[PDB]
């Protein structure tokens, strides 16, 4: 089970660009269709998804693949929202980053015996820009490569 009524919105969005009745819609109009359902990806994500959708260079996506892409986008969006909520739980001081203080506070509240050296080891292994902590995007990325969620 994925969706019950949200599929109708995706069908409407596809049919808006499928007014010619060819069964497929143009890849270039993919951004508008996402904006037809509220999705607002950046240019990099649009290029990445066009590359995956149009590997064979057809330039069109059918109903099934469009529905699958929309479902994947919705799942990733709600996962991102939950990850943001987790970040806020960690960043209860609203610093924009899960600093070492935030991680230590969460660990002590969690009651785990995770050593401060291990906390900073995780921070650095989750630190990419070298700012000395973990940012929103860094936490998002490490969750994306997370073992399971």
Which spans of this chain sit near Ca ion (rule: CB under 5 A)?
A: 91, 93, 95, 99, 102, 129, 131, 135, 138
78: Cα within 13 Å, side-chain hemisphere: 7
Q: Residue 125, interface with another protein (CB under 8 A)?
A: yes
Stretch that binds another protein, among 25-33, 48-56, 69-77, 85-93 (CB under 8 A): 85-93
Q: Residue 149, interface with another protein (CB under 8 A)?
A: yes
Does residue 136 contact residue 96 with C-beta atoms inside 8 Å? Answer: yes
CA distance 69 to 75: 10
* Binding positions for another protein, 99-118, rule CB under 8 A: 106-107, 110, 112, 114, 118
131 is in an annotated binding site: yes
Which residues does 12 contact at the CB level (< 8 Å), separation at least 6? Answer: 36
Distances (CA, A) of 118 to 67, 103, 113, 114, 115: 43, 11, 10, 6, 5
| Angular region, 58: left φ>0, alpha ψ -120 to 50, beta rest | alpha
Cβ-based nearer residue to another protein, 17 or 90: 90
Chosen residue from 42, 43, 55, 145 binding another protein by CB under 8 A: 145
Stretch that binds another protein, among 33-41, 49-57, 62-70, 139-147 (CB under 8 A): 139-147
Angle, nearest 10°, between helix axes 100-110 and 63-90? Answer: 90
Q: Residue 22, interface with another protein (CB under 8 A)?
A: no
Residues that bind another protein (CB under 8 A): 86, 89-90, 106-107, 110, 112, 114, 118, 121-122, 125-126, 142-143, 145-149
């Amino acid at each position: 089970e994925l969706t019950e009524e949200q599929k109708q919105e995706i069908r409407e969005a596809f049919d808006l660009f499928d007014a010619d009745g060819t069964g497929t819609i143009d890849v270039k109009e993919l951004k508008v269709a996402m904006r037809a359902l509220g999705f607002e990806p950046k240019k990099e994500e649009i290029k990445k998804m066009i590359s995956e959708i149009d590997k064979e260079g057809t330039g069109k996506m059918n109903f099934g693949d469009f529905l699958t892409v929309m479902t994947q986008k919705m799942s990733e969006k709600d996962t991102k929202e939950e990850i943001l909520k987790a970040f806020k739980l960690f960043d209860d001081d609203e610093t924009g980053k899960i600093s070492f203080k935030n991680l230590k506070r969460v660990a002590k509240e969690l009651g785990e015996n995770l050593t401060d050296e291990e906390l900073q080891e995780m921070i650095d292994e989750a630190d990419r820009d070298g700012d000395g902590e973990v940012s929103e995007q860094e936490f998002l990325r490490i969750m994306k490569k997370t073992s399971l969620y």
